[PDB]
Amino acid sequence: SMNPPPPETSNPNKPKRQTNQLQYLLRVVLKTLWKHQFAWPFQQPVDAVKLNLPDYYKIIKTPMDMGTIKKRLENNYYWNAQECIQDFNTMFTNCYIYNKPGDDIVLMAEALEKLFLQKINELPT
Ligand SMILES: Cc1ccc2c(c1)NC(=O)[C@@H](C)O2
């Protein structure tokens, strides 16, 4: 099959936590980025079959997307904010790795990453 199984959104072995900052990442950061005009490519795992990108997972080995992150946050999958933020960053870097500078999808990611940075610049205490 061209698509791998999607990243886990739960894990019984992994310890959960809820924090003010993780709460913020879901209610404010994720759910605001979600509403951006450029959010749609990043709202679900890359479907290599659907998007006709047969080489995507030959290149990207740590896929990540906001749909996954959203479910992780809802499941309280994360231990801390940093874990969630590194997922966001993985998603953006994946886009820059797979695509070329100037590509439309890259312009989109660049715009979201800027907004993402603006919102995590200050987190609740
Ligand atoms: C055609 C197409 C649609 C959506 C897309 C892409 C390519 N390329 C990507 O890297 C992902 C994240 O988003």
In a domain, 90, yes or no: yes
What's the resolution in A?
2.0
Residue whose Cα lies nearest atom 2 of ligand 1: it is: 51
25 lies in some domain = yes
Burial of residue 25, with CB atoms counted within 10 A of its CB: 0-12 exposed, 13-18 middle, 19 or more buried? buried
Helices (H) and strands (E) in the chain, counts: 6, 0
In a domain, 6, yes or no: no
CA 98 to ligand 1: nearest atom: 10
Question: Is 1 within the bounds of a domain?
Answer: no
Q: Would you say residue 60 lies in a domain?
A: yes
Q: Please give the backbone phi and psi of residue 82, each rounded to the nearest 5 degrees, phi first.
A: -60, -35
Domain annotation covers residue 7? no
Query: What would the two tokens of residue 115 be?
Result: 């907004």
- Among 43, 105, 106, 108, the mutation site with the greatest number of ligand 1 atoms within 8 A of its Cβ is 105
Dist CA 75 CA 22 (whole Å): 11
Gap from CA of 45 to ligand 1 centroid (Å) = 10
CATH number for the domain spanning 25: value is 1.20.920.10
- Residue 14, domain member (yes or no): no
Q: What is the number of other CB atoms lying within 10 angstroms of the CB of residue 40?
A: 11
> Does a structural domain hold residue 76?
yes
The count of structural domains within the chain is: 1
Q: Provide the domain limits for residue 64.
A: 19-123
Give the phi and the psi of residue 123 in degrees, each rounded to 5. Answer: -105, 155
Nearest CA to ligand 1 atom 1: 51
